[model samples]
Target: GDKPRAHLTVVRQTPTQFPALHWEHELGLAFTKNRMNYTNKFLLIPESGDYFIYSQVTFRGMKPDSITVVITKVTDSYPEPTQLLMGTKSVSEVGSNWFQPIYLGAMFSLQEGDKLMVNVSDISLVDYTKEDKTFFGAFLL
Candidate 1:
């Protein structure tokens, strides 16, 4: 059972650089059977296995830019990190308050030392106070 060692849970506490950057999880939490690295703005995979991966992003800003949610796998063993899953939506509104949530989840085979992170087009729209605002996690199966 994938109960203990191979699991990770992290959430955004502050904003990160947008358009092509990593999202920081300052108020992150985990209950892993295997130790993972939370060095900067990514979750490091501890072992190689098929794991269920998921992420969510909520946008609530006045930015007229389109929103995109992405999850990528970064490994030093590989030439480059590949984008595993993504979700994008066109946001168009002229107001100080708006709400849009993007979500993505899938089971992926990951290697040890693989790094994962979340991204959005606009960084300022990320809400990182409570649990339900945005989240990212993985459970090995």
Candidate 2:
């Protein structure tokens, strides 16, 4: 069997009040196995261990100069969110119909109660139409 893990795909995102994007945790290719929990757009850590975390976000209509994808960690011990991994790409397309995909991944020692979430620079630019195009996942090492 595999270690505790979760893979989440992007869902339809209306303009939310926050910067974190929403995900489809139980449907499509998304799944939370062996105690990894997904709630309120945050992946709740199941145990204290080293884990590999990853995310990929597709952007459409390149109007902004750059796009950012961030994997943040939140814990009760700290009030600030820790930026565990980030992929920021500068965009300079000639046409208005350009698209870009930013992928970020890394390994980290995570606490049992740590919360993980993904964030982007622009919510409107994220393409939420496909499961393969935008996704996030993490697995204990």
Candidate 3:
């Protein structure tokens, strides 16, 4: 059996500098398309058993929307990324300057020295602006 895990938070942002603009260069550095793409990397040491990979993301100042968090394993010894987990959420119920964190699931495992990364993709910038929009995620041991 796996241990009970704590909650982690993820934040995604869309600003108001250029409202109604696509996530392009109009909003400059704060645009969701150009400056909002990111991923978090972590190194883990796991016990020889099952583990749960859970995540939650909060979107700000953008339309309630959906994005994908891709969990991959990185190793210089390997040629390609090893896909371990994938999480998605739709923030259709959230509002401006508001946040909604969606729990993904508990269905993945890790090993010692395993590198984990959370990547956000297929981003849609709603109500684009000049403020900085960020997307972030973390995990528990």
Candidate 4:
């Protein structure tokens, strides 16, 4: 009938850090809680026009006080961050968790050689200051 409008690929990994304190006691789980850092490398091929970039993050029992996702173009030169797409913050619930997806509009046109990425940061709900952690991320085009 018609060509596919968009495609989705799941990119997931267990971050180095585990959930913060209190959570370990409450959930009866023990893990190393550390800063959240992740990178997504993907190719972009536009058949005709432009396309949209979107990402969804599912926080399990570990409540996050704040979160941020940055998307930048990669270059051969030194690392210079550009065009921050998505950034958000939310409070955590007691028992229930949260799932949020943000749509980063077409700030620039899609090209054959353009490289885009999704970077993530997460803070633990249990401990706000002392020990915070981060998870993984996925890209949808």
Candidate 5:
């Protein structure tokens, strides 16, 4: 195929830490096709074009009062990272286990070498038990 696309699944072994989330791009249901590449937690663009980006993060915890997911774009041409999409919601469940999934998707003009990554308000709260529950992907349009 000529189109650049990739669908990444959650890495179940190591605990995905911090503001940025890492994924498994080459195993199971995850893959990077054409010229798109996933490395070091960023989806590296291979050409300049419009691309549809998306992510779904399932959060499960009882401590955090709120949860947020952000898809960010980084370019070598700029010094700052650009936020493409964001999903946020307050957590109100108390004394019980709760699961909240935040999904974000949008189309954007991307350039070669541009990098994309997902960020969350908290790391420990994200659920990585299933691949479909927590995932990230993008494709050239």
Candidate 6:
């Protein structure tokens, strides 16, 4: 298999949540590149290798506790997806504008069809928008 592959990223412009993290398409770097797959929100691995995966969830905690952000891997063998990385914030404070952000990133060995996604404790708290304030991506090594 000599097919070429590249890195990909996604930013949500709407309430696009699949337990992972969307589309500022045409708005600055609000677009996909290097054969990114937006339909599934996962860059299908053309060639299995080590990839640097990262994600950031910008959320304001109105609730007592903050949210949980996780990078998960869905595979053909495993019945349930496994958590590759995770990030969480402390319980909320009184300030309404207190941004409790959870950023998770790391390098992981992946394989073809290893669908990647972001999962959160509270989806409503996620700063879902067409902004770089929240994002998820992976780069091949």
Top lDDT model = 2
The lowest-lDDT stretch of 10 consecutive residues in candidate 4 is 19-28
Q: What TM-score do all the candidates reach, one by one?
A: 0.78, 0.95, 0.44, 0.46, 0.93, 0.76
lDDT of residue 128 for candidate 4: 24
lDDT of 3 by residue, 21-102 (tens): 1122223332112112222324333332344554433334444366555556665567886776666666556555654433
lDDT of 4 by residue, 1-141 (tens): 232132233323334422211112112222212211122333333233354544434334444565555555544443764553665656555555554443344534444444555555652322122112322122223
Per-residue alpha-carbon lDDT of model 1 for 69-112, expressed as tens digits?
88888888789668899898887777768887888999998888
Candidate number of the best TM-score: 2
What are the lDDT figures for the candidates, one per model?
0.68, 0.91, 0.40, 0.37, 0.90, 0.64
lDDT of 5 by residue, 1-141 (tens): 689999999875355333899999988899999989898889999999999999999998746778999999999989989999989999898855888799889899999999999998988788888888999999999
Instruction: Kindly report which residue stretches of model 1 are placed more than 4 angstroms away from their true locations once superposed.
Output: 1-33
Against the hidden true structure, what lDDT does model 2 obtain?
Answer: 0.91
Candidate 2 residue 17 C-alpha distance from true site, Å = 9.5
Error of 6 at 12 (Å): 5.8
Per-residue accuracy of model 2 over 63-108 as CA lDDT, tens digit each: 5888899999999899999999989988887568788899888999
Is 4 or 6 the stronger prediction by TM-score? 6
Determine the C-alpha RMSD for candidate 6 after optimal superposition of all C-alphas: 3.6
Error of 3 at 133 (Å): 16
> What clash pairs does model 6 have?
11-22, 11-23, 12-22, 13-23, 19-118, 20-118
lDDT ranking, high to low: 2, 5, 1, 6, 3, 4
> How do these models rank on TM-score, best leading?
2, 5, 1, 6, 4, 3
Stretches off by above 4 angstroms in model 5 are 13-18
Error (Å) of candidate 6 at residue 19 is: 3.8
Worst 10-residue lDDT window, candidate 2? 10-19
